[PDB]
Amino acid sequence: XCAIDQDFLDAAGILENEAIDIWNVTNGKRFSTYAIAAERGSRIISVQGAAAHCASVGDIVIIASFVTMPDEEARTWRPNVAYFEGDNEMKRTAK
């Protein structure tokens, strides 16, 4: 796979080539792949190769990455969340 606007990657803290899970609200499908960078500002979310069987243009999806750390560090961990409006325009998150 999935190519993602590099701005979006940065906002969610996801790295190029990092494993990602994708959960499709439109069709229910859930799959795992890795992140490819698309051009900053392109607002692209492109499913490539076999992943094209799991989403179509227009589908609404959640894209997540997961990390590991010790128990103690996990108790104050804060995930990055990026929110969107209209045509993949990033909006500010609340508390």
Binding site: I45, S46, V47, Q48, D71, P79, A82
Partner: peptide, 28 residues
């Protein structure tokens, strides 16, 4: 409270919430 342990947790690092797919490309 959850007691402290020595184990490694898998935690949500971050997510894109309700982003919309723009392209689907089976062959590339």
């Amino acid at each position: 409270l959850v007691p402290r342990g020595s184990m490694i947790r898998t935690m949500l690092q971050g997510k894109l919430h309700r982003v919309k797919v723009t392209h689907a490309d089976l062959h590339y």
